[PDB]
């Protein structure tokens, strides 16, 4: 009788951690969402099926949904790889499924089945410029590293920028791990842009600004996401103070929507949750709205397109839209700044 949402997550093997932060974010949510009265009254329930973060495996656990007709959609899958192995086989089952941090910009064009709850890493590109253009700046230092996710939001970030006007003096791009700061530090000296843009993450990044604000550099500085961490702080200490970033998840969050997820987590799990744990929890949400708007007569068919509809969705990790065509996450992400130790909401 209660409806079923099938859940491919890794709860063995080296990332079964994503996994449990999935299913603790998970239990929340639907526990929630049943107790507001499930779907006109009828609960609904979720088949969790442990994919072992396996290709093979996430392909028998996907041909196991698709052959139980009670399945009407599926929650899936932490990694990109393995996400799409089984988006295979739902794309042509006609499944539709709903992958809270599957990332790589090929996983949505799999099939017409395919949703995300995450942003691509480029995403974060055309928002950061977008920002730094409405501050007042026309020319800048791009600093990124030659990961995939780096060089992805470093080119959308330069694009926008140029697109708004702007220009890019200094255009680095450094390896992960990098620890020589001199030359580039020379390069913004001689070249005087007026702020830097950081496409890195923080293990890199404190060292980076501790080298640069050693040499008594007072320019602004912005970066991706992916200095998100108290680490970023513990790391960089006084030299990390004033840099901005924008991110989803807001852990120290005022954002009543929020908090209330933050609080009930951590009361609920006695640890803080992560912005996977985040994507998972709205992840959930996200489905079983689209399941409340598809009715108790809901069919995997009916749930894609409520899926496809997730206009402004209010979740944790910022208002969420499915683009109406590509189907592509876009997320109002939250400005914030390093001050006195500790990210702001500006």
């Known amino acids: 009788l209660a409806l079923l949402l099938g859940y491919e997550l890794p709860l063995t093997g080296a990332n ?26 009828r609960p609904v329930d979720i088949l969790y099926a442990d994919s072992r973060d396996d ?11 698709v052959d139980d007709p009670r399945v009407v959609g599926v929650l899936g899958d932490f990694s990109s790889t393995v996400s799409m192995a089984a988006g295979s086989i739902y794309g042509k089952e006609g499944m539709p ?6 990332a790589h910009p090929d996983y949505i064009k799999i099939s017409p089945w395919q949703f995300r709850a995450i942003t691509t ?15 007042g700046f026309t020319s800048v230092a791009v600093i990124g590293v030659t990961t995939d996710w780096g060089l992805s939001s470093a080119q959308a970030f330069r694009k926008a920028f140029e ?30 842009p007026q702020a830097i843009y950081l496409a890195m993450a923080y293990e890199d990044a404190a060292p980076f600004l501790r080298a640069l604000r050693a040499r008594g550099s007072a320019l602004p500085v912005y970066g991706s996401s992916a200095l998100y961490s108290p680490k970023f702080i513990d790391l960089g200490g006084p030299a990390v103070e004033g840099v901005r970033l924008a991110t989803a998840f807001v852990l120290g969050a005022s954002d009543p929507v929020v908090v209330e ?9 006695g640890a803080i949750p992560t ?3 985040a994507h998972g929890y709205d992840a959930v949400g996200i489905m079983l709205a689209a399941v409340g708007r598809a009715g108790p007569e809901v ?15 209010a979740g944790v990790t910022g208002i969420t839209r499915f683009d109406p065509e590509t189907r592509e996450t876009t997320k109002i992400l939250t400005r914030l700044v390093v001050r006195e130790g500790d990210f702001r909401v500006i």
């Open 121 to 135: 890493p480029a995403f974060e590109g055309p928002n950061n410029a977008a920002w730094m253009i409405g501050d």
């Open 16 to 41: 079964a951690a994503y996994g449990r932060v999935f299913q603790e974010a998970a239990r929340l949510q639907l526990d929630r969402f049943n107790a507001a009265g499930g779907v006109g009254g």
């Open 97 to 102: 499924q709903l992958s809270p941090t599957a």
């Open 299 to 313: 069919t995997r068919e009916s749930l894609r397109d409520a899926l496809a509809a997730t206009d402004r969705y």
């Open 261 to 269: 997820f933050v609080s009930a987590y951590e009361t609920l799990y």
């Open 55 to 65: 290709a093979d495996q996430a392909r028998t656990i996907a041909r196991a949904f």
């Open 275 to 277: 912005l996977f744990a």
């Open 163 to 192: 697109l708004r006007g702007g220009a890019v003096v200094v255009n680095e791009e450094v390896p992960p791990g990098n620890r020589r700061f001199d030359d580039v530090i020379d390069e913004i000296e001689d070249e005087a």
